[PDB]
Amino acid sequence: EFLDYKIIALLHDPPNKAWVITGRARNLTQQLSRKHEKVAKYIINQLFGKNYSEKVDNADKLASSIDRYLGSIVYKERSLFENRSIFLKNILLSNIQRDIGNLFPKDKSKLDNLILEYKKLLNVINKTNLILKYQLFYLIYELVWIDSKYENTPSDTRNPTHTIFDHLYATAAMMNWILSLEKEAKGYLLGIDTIGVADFISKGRKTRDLWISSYLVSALLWYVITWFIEEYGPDVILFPSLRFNQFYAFYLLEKLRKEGVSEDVIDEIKELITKYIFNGDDLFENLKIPPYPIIPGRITLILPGLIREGEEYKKVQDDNCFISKVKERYNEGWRKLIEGLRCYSERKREDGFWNLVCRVLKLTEDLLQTTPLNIRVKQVSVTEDEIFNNNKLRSDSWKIYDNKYRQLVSEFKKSKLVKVTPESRLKLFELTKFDKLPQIGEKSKRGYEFCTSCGVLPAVVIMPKEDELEKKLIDLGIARDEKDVRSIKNMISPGERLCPWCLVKRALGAEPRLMRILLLGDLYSVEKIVNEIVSRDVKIEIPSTSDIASIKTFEEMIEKKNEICEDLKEEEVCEKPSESVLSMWQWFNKNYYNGINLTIDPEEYWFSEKRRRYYFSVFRRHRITFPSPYYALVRADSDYLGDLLEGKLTPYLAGIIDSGDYANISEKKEEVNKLLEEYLVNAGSGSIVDYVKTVLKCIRENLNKCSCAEKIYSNEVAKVMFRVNVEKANVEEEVKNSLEYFETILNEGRIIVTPAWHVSISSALNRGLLVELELVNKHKGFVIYAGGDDLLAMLPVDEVLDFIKESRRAFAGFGTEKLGNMCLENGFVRINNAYYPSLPIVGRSYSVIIAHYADPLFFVINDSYNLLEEGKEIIRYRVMYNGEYKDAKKDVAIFRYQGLTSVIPLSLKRPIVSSVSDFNEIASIIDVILELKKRIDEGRISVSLLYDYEKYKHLIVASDEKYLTEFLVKDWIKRNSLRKHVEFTIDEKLYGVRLTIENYPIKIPNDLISNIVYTLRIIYGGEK
């Protein structure tokens, strides 16, 4: 029968929840006449009536931690520990609050207005797709709340840690478990992590191969979870939270466009999507796909013990259902994609290139059966024996979701010890021995001619070398005339050998619209997607490394449009843009319709050999700086994000409680017991903070079980009797459970995780994603992939220090400008008065590679990934912890340039932020290096400054006097200045900073002040 009434699980407690409690004027409490959910009941008008006996006695106590922080008697009675004000504390930082103010539904009329806005978007849907209205509501319930200006509320002013939405979505996520146990029995946790993504992304000549590799990584997982989001609704994914998800919103309004919905209500929500889920650009309507791959190849799911095909939900039949299901769904996604590729190819047997796609797909189907990228799926289960006592929840029924989650991840660790590359699933013995290998091109005089993109698989298509290609492609199976060469040579550089998987990549990159095949997912038939793709022909141009090395030159040529193309207009440069092309590269769209043909190939014009005499002379006469061949590959990631999601303290002190300090926490007892109490006391202003710190004074110094609570029960029993409507007396035990929970935390050494924790984290993660997206585009970068914590973008070597500074400060949630509609503010993200938290306590590392535009992207990507993953865990710098110099691990910026390395710390305080004074210390050295870079450009300081510091370090390190080191650096700068009197004044907190290493081939100066000059040498080598 029909079940899964989580629509009220999303509404049981309204977003008007904190003002109706401790009201200022008390109007809605008298104009609606068991106290405050009256409002939500009134809000229940669009769908089924509210069930009150299924989501407050469970799945609300189990979703968030408030049930265990406050106590299950003060949690519900909601009146015995009060406060006037209304704050909101960052989940990771209970230190900084907010001033909520009052822009919320007060009148009995405006609430009707918001109901009407929900209705007009939810009244055009019928009831045959019962699940589709819940689907769209899951997304727009917050977008409408914040679109109309309304600041969002915490779960309770007694503990302002979770925003009202994360609590709601968390109750909904737990409802998957609670329905599945009020029914017969089950409860599930499904995790999926793609095997070796770093190796897969590092496989491609052109950037248009990295882009589609990452896009496939995101899209295959999107295809497998399409089944779940349509089956059990969207709120089945606990990572990544799809509340601010571009892929999800795209799929959602595309499915809404499907089946027929008036194209007048589709816009009312498309504007919501384009403004907030995106940042204010609807190019995904002009590209027909979400422009950025943003799905992390590692997802989680809360699965219920139910299944369909009884036309409704029946109990699952076995305990191997979802593993097999996701495996077959994944392989099915890949096979559907390649089938659509072959269909779209046959639809264009002309154009040469697609003809080759045809005549190689038909030859290698038996080799394309295996997906180029496999996954690794684990699951953990639970039964009502664990969260029930035949009448209610158990005590320790809260520590279940943790113990299961902590369970699941451990399994992954086990499977991780063995890595099996995808190329091993093939069967290449009879091919590579008995010459059965299909070979479009020259049969290699030496066996079988390995590929050039993946470099590991035998190549199928062997483009000849560039000696005389036109007479070399016709007499071979590649071409048929002189016309196809101008389109085959357009996407296969002469000389490239291509494997089946690498050629499939090249073909998908020829036009990135077949990806919809996977983005929609059993939604349209493959032929229906292809027939759209073959209907419109708009070109999607992905840059190259050369197009990004030549950014500043294109810029300088749009500021001299006519003058620099007077002598031109015979070279197809000032040629008028004749097509309707567009790119996911925002800087490209910003130009092109600025006078210069940005579709040219710098490899063909000035990065070429037969030419560039012409172009050098041109750039010379018109005061144009001839370009540099170097771009910069920036890669980022958060540190100890797994440890974070597991609730550890390592993200807080990254360098002290390292990873083996949880194999035995007793050796780090002092630091955990200081930090956890510092956080717990600091979360919840109210009237309970004193109560809580008295509970901790009890726990502190191992005061025995309730042999001490008599010190504290007073502080509750004196207060429980401030209210009379309290029905029964239950204060004899709740004060015991409270310190039992607090001792549980302080003795396990980590905050116990709950679904609220996870949604609150992995929503801020996508918000930071949306922020860094607009950050990269500001610095003329090109986002290959950027999902939450990670990032992989190609920028010019000129705006990489600026970008690192800005992106680091923004990841903490602290900036200066608005980034679209995400107006970030000192640890929060203000979307038009809605304060969502951020990740200020989390450390983020960076790995910049200044690479020649012609370096092989395979090795560049491998070295970037290796530098990050290795250096971030092997180098230690002097950090101050509670006024005491210790050693730290993470938050470094590792620059490399063909043999020059440098590391730049970004924390200098091991708890990176505990106040609001810290938000300027963030990456405060990168702006020092910036200041120094803007002195050498102005010619005030000489570049000898970088080749002179050594004869000053040998004296500056043996020194223990600050005011002497200051004179010494001033003299090192004085001796190398060119103008009257420069002023650099290094901040004197960098002196004595000691970087170290655990004996790796990375060479690094042991002082930050020398890493600064090495970073400058790297940057300037980038302009060579």
Print the SS3 string covering 332-380. Answer: HHHHHHHHHHHHHHHCCCCCCHHHHHHHHHCCCHHHHCCCCCCEEEEEE
The interface partner of residue 419, options being other proteins, Mn ion, Zn ion, none and the CB cut-off 5 to 8 Å by kind, is: other proteins
Distance CA 289, CA 648 (A): 38
Contact between 425 and other proteins per CB under 8 A: yes
Contact between 891 and Mn ion per CB under 5 A: no
Options 20-28, 212-220, 638-646, 733-741: segment touching Mn ion (CB under 5 A): 638-646
* Tokens matching residue 106: 């007060």
Contact between 734 and other proteins per CB under 8 A: no
To the question of whether residue 701 is assigned a binding role by annotation, the answer is no
User: Please, how many CA atoms are within 13 Å of residue 742, restricted to the half-sphere of its CB?
Assistant: 31
Contact between 637 and Mn ion per CB under 5 A: yes
Within 10 angstroms of residue 1010's Cβ, the number of other Cβ atoms is 19
* Nearest distance from C-beta of residue 466 to other proteins, angstroms: 5
Is the Cβ of residue 229 or residue 636 nearer to ligand ANP in the bound state? 636
Would you give the distance in Å from CA 537 to the centre of its chain? 32
Contact between 643 and Mn ion per CB under 5 A: no
Contact between 495 and other proteins per CB under 8 A: yes
Could you say which residues in the range 165-204 bind ligand ANP, by CB under 6 A? 193-198, 201
* Nearest distance from C-beta of residue 978 to ligand ANP, angstroms: 43
To the question of whether residue 281 is assigned a binding role by annotation, the answer is no
Within 10 angstroms of residue 600's Cβ, the number of other Cβ atoms is 17
Print the SS3 string covering 682-730. Answer: HCCCCCCHHHHHHHHHHHCCCCCCCCCHHHCHHHHHHHHCCCCCCCCCC
Contact between 646 and Mn ion per CB under 5 A: no
Could you say which residues in the range 575-634 bind other proteins, by CB under 8 A? 603, 607, 609
* Nearest distance from C-beta of residue 480 to Zn ion, angstroms: 25
To the question of whether residue 451 is assigned a binding role by annotation, the answer is yes
Contact between 820 and other proteins per CB under 8 A: no
Residue 218 CB partners (closer than 8 Å, separation 6+): 247, 293, 294, 295, 297, 785, 787
Could you say which residues in the range 623-682 bind ligand ANP, by CB under 6 A? 637-643, 645
Could you say which residues in the range 934-953 bind other proteins, by CB under 8 A? 936-937, 939, 942-944, 947, 950
Is the Cβ of residue 67 or residue 789 nearer to ligand ANP in the bound state? 789
Contact between 146 and ligand ANP per CB under 6 A: no
Residue 163, SS3 per DSSP: strand
Cα separation values, 648 from 668, 695, 991, Å: 13, 22, 32
Cβ 337 vs Cβ 237: under 8 Å: no
The interface partner of residue 297, options being ligand ANP, other proteins, Zn ion, none and the CB cut-off 5 to 8 Å by kind, is: ligand ANP
Give CA angle at 198 (196, 204), nearest 5°: 115
The interface partner of residue 502, options being ligand ANP, other proteins, Zn ion, none and the CB cut-off 5 to 8 Å by kind, is: Zn ion
* Nearest distance from C-beta of residue 750 to other proteins, angstroms: 11
Could you say which residues in the range 349-378 bind other proteins, by CB under 8 A? none
Cβ 837 vs Cβ 813: under 8 Å: yes
Contact between 418 and other proteins per CB under 8 A: yes
Options 181-189, 526-534, 633-641, 823-831: segment touching Mn ion (CB under 5 A): 633-641
Is the Cβ of residue 426 or residue 720 nearer to other proteins in the bound state? 426
Contact between 156 and ligand ANP per CB under 6 A: no
Could you say which residues in the range 959-1018 bind other proteins, by CB under 8 A? 998-1001, 1003-1005, 1014, 1017
* Tokens matching residue 847: 């790995």
Binding to ligand ANP by CB under 6 A, coded x per residue (else -) over 788-807, reads -xx-----------------
DSSP per-residue letters across 568-609 = -SSSSSS----S--B-S-HHHHHSSSSSS-TTS-HHHHTS-S
To the question of whether residue 502 is assigned a binding role by annotation, the answer is yes
Contact between 214 and ligand ANP per CB under 6 A: yes
Cβ 831 vs Cβ 276: under 8 Å: yes
* Tokens matching residue 4: 């899964």
To the question of whether residue 358 is assigned a binding role by annotation, the answer is no
DSSP per-residue letters across 649-683 = STTTSTTTS-STTTT-GGGGHHHHHHHHHHHHHHS
Contact between 873 and other proteins per CB under 8 A: yes
Distance CA 600, CA 51 (A): 63
Options 438-446, 778-786, 802-810, 826-834: segment touching other proteins (CB under 8 A): 438-446
Contact between 409 and ligand ANP per CB under 6 A: yes
Could you say which residues in the range 283-322 bind ligand ANP, by CB under 6 A? 293, 295-298
Contact between 193 and Mn ion per CB under 5 A: yes
Element (H, E) at 181: helix 164-182
Among 145, 897, 972, 991, binds other proteins (CB under 8 A): 897
To the question of whether residue 321 is assigned a binding role by annotation, the answer is no
Is the Cβ of residue 502 or residue 515 nearer to other proteins in the bound state? 502
To the question of whether residue 193 is assigned a binding role by annotation, the answer is yes
Options 33-41, 78-86, 630-638, 889-897: segment touching Mn ion (CB under 5 A): 630-638
Residue 901 CB partners (closer than 8 Å, separation 6+): 867, 894, 895, 1002, 1003, 1004, 1014, 1018
Could you say which residues in the range 694-713 bind ligand ANP, by CB under 6 A? none
Distance CA 108, CA 112 (A): 7
To the question of whether residue 706 is assigned a binding role by annotation, the answer is no
Distance CA 358, CA 366 (A): 15
Give CA angle at 278 (170, 64), nearest 5°: 10
* Tokens matching residue 401: 């979701």
If we measure between CA atoms, which residue out of 842, 836, 917 comes closest to residue 88? 836
Could you say which residues in the range 47-106 bind other proteins, by CB under 8 A? none
Is the Cβ of residue 449 or residue 790 nearer to other proteins in the bound state? 449
Distance CA 244, CA 139 (A): 8
* Nearest distance from C-beta of residue 652 to other proteins, angstroms: 18
Site size toward other proteins, by CB under 8 A: 84
If we measure between CA atoms, which residue out of 229, 280, 119 comes closest to residue 773? 280
Is the Cβ of residue 180 or residue 762 nearer to ligand ANP in the bound state? 762
Q: Which residues sit opposite 111 in a β-bridge?
A: none
Residues that bind Zn ion (CB under 5 A): 451, 453-454, 457, 499, 502
If we measure between CA atoms, which residue out of 895, 995, 877, 1020 comes closest to residue 945? 1020
Question: Which residue ranges make up the annotated binding site?
Answer: 193-195, 451, 454, 499, 502, 637-638, 869
List of residues contacting ligand ANP (CB under 6 A): 193-198, 201, 214, 217-218, 239, 293, 295-298, 409, 416, 419, 637-643, 645, 785, 787, 789-790
**Which segments are annotated as binding site for Mn(2+)?**
193-195, 637-638, 869
Q: Which residues define the annotated binding site for Zn(2+)? A: 451, 454, 499, 502
Residues interacting with Mn ion, by CB under 5 A? 193-194, 637, 641
